[PDB]
Amino acid sequence: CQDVVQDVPNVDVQMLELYDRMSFKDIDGGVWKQGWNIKYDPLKYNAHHKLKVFVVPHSHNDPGWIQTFEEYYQHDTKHILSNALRHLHDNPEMKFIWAEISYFARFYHDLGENKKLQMKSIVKNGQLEFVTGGWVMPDEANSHWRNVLLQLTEGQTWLKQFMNVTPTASWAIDPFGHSPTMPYILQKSGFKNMLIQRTHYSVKKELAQQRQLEFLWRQIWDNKGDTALFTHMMPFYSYDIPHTCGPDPKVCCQFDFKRMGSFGLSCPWKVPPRTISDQNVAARSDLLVDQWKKKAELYRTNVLLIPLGDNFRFKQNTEWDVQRVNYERLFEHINSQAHFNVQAQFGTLQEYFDAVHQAERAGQAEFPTLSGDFFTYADRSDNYWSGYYTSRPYHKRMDRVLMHYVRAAEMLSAWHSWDGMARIEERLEQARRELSLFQHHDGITGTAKTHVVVDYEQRMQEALKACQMVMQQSVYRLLTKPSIYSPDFSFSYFTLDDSRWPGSGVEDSRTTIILGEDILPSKHVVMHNTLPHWREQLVDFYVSSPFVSVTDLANNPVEAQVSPVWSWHHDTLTKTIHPQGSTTKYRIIFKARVPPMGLATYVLTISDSKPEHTSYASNLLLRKNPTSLPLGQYPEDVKFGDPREISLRVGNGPTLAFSEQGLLKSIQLTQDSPHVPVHFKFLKYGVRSHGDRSGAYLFLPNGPASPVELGQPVVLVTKGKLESSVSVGLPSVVHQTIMRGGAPEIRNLVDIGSLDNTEIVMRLETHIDSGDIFYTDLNGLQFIKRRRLDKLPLQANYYPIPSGMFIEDANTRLTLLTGQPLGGSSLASGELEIMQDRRLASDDERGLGQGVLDNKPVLHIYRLVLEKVNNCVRPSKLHPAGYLTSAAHKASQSLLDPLDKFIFAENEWIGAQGQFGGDHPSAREDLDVSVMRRLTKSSAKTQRVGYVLHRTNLMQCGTPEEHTQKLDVCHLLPNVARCERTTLTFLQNLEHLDGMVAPEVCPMETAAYVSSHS
């Protein structure tokens, strides 16, 4: 295995190093506004060395943005695809590329058989080519790598089944900045090439000057280069026709033949296209070939890519004709005029890349190596697209909840083969497709119109219900004596209980377990653990009495804690935000211990008085002018006091101190150790009163953030043996710090209300001497080093925080893990900050046509890990990556893949069993079974189950941490007949494995395996 820590890769371009050296000056470069006046030697091309030009027609189709998926399908996309089928069928030399399989599958299934056959023929013959082949073209900033792989697999599995093709070239022309997670997944999924477009204009200029726009993009930790994927970065400001023929848009716009009047389009540079004729073709060709030869100067081979397309293009039959016939007249002239030394034709993306690599093999070019990412994007001036790292945060959090429910539903149901009447495959395909659709670069990004956001939300709610159905049918089957199991596939044997989604204060969605001597004395509950190691975690349920005790199924008592159910109210009469306790519902909390990829059953039983193994939390309400807070049968009376500082410690864990405003002020790791300053603070950013305004995409603050004025907030302290917490009602945020014996959990119930033109940020202030360095993750997969640059504006220093961020010095590290993607930064040494929500009244001129005024309450979740790192083996100061410690990684897993909780619905569960998975191997802590999916339906004689195995890399800090078992996924199901290593989409077999054993993977590697069972 390669060492991902100690060997700094030697690459030609390392983006952090490039950023440190670049000046980012925004000067007027002439017609290429953000470049320079390109010059070329006319003698470079001649009869023995011609410029080969591939004009690649395309149409950018968004699966929701200004209209919903279905509205665009009906108004635009079905017509584009119907006319592409007709025009390509009738014009053999015409070509077209297509990226979004969600739309193509919607179209293809509605075609009659004759047309399905014509479509398969134009694909098989190379006229219509799929590029990437994912369900969508995903956002690359906020998306989790597991969901980028899920959507890629959904689209490619459909293409293999119906079209018999698997794309090996990727096309990503619209995500707002680009992540190395894409080549990581694509290279492990059979790809050979990829193309990107939205990168900072200063980066395009710098790389163009060195002819480094084509490069072998490897991961930041890859010393050998085996992760490398050839990448083509487009050079100009847009993928539209005016910015794809060459450097001068006033000229290129004349070659977009849809802009002459009858289509309602024109050229803003004021020179319209003119129909090509025999009297003007020489002058028009002279202008176009000049643009092409200028573009060619920015690249190393004699093969040139010229995209020809824009948003929802190629819709009307007359548009297909006007573009095709005019370009055909230009090609016939150009190709017959030797003095141009050009051979131009319509082509596909794969044809371009195959010709580039033929040139490379002929020794005509060598390409530079590159590592790093392409965030944060700016398309012009100081307009940095860091706002969408936070926009519509409710849905960003929903993404992560659904991510986990899809994994858990696919894994729980994979253990058995199911009859078709159970509708398991149907519900899982619906859930995978709605979560996949939301990965779109106007979905999770929060950049769609309000009614489109509602459509994505409704689709995801249906997907969550589908996952719940599959999960509860699977738990009932896995834990019921076989000869007793009698399923009704439409019945709810269990209901899921989720404590953090939508969350307390967001929706009252949880069911109370109703017990009583005259109705039901006890209730079975079941926990699932999707991770491949034994895991303990506190779990809580609402119960109708405080006198409840817990047992495992062998009837062994389990220690439990009961606390009140507290809800916060914005009291419009007293004008204060304060908590109310329930006098008939209570929370019971206990530690569940669950096998690897397994289930564990417990029983909750009511008694007439305080049970021996259940304790009760104390509660203290700090505020001036308190009023009583009765709690029904709860056995401990609420105490009151004036605001004051307080300290809490649960178990042997850290001791946390809080200010009189209920905000953390210090963390003391052990009895002996020091009280380290760690202060939470809430601040607000505003919007500029003149100049450009922040909107869904852009973050354009009117200077550094200002502190939220807190007043004298109400603080609630709950102290228990198993769990303690401090909660405070601040303006727009109920902020909660929860302690269970390890790193605290932070929950913010964020309701920005009607505060227009405001972005609320949560900042941590420490005295850690981090300087200008901080680390943020990319897609939940890797941590990359960031350097704050005072030569760039504040918004350029904001990066996506898809799952975590940290700062450190020689001795101390503070890591904040997140349960949802948000934007953040470290704007000064010792600080971390992360945006909570943003409400903007203005549109930011990128096409959305509205501000962001549809905010709703969201419960954000986090874990805060302060650690000593002086003993850790860390990368050298020149390495571009960082790595988590064991405790930080486990804290991230506690947020993203918590235990699932099921409450048995009926009064009695006949045939109930206590555990499932006790014999499953408990794998080393850095290994995860990211995906477990049965790939065959019940009628297949040979069953197949696919697994994606991911190993992260954790720092070595001196903990012996030992005894774990080897995990061989190919032997998790019995009767194994074959084990194969496959691409990550499961679509191609790469290796037949000896002994039917699937090896574990190396740190930072991901592999897929498929086991076959007789």
Ligand SMILES: *[C@H]1O[C@H](CO)[C@@H](O)[C@H](O)[C@H]1NC(C)=O
């Ligand atoms: C397409 O798939 C392979 C090449 O990928 C080809 O040999 C096969 O005949 C085609 N279609 C079928 C029958 O799978």
Ligand SMILES: [Zn+2]
């Ligand atoms: Zn788009």
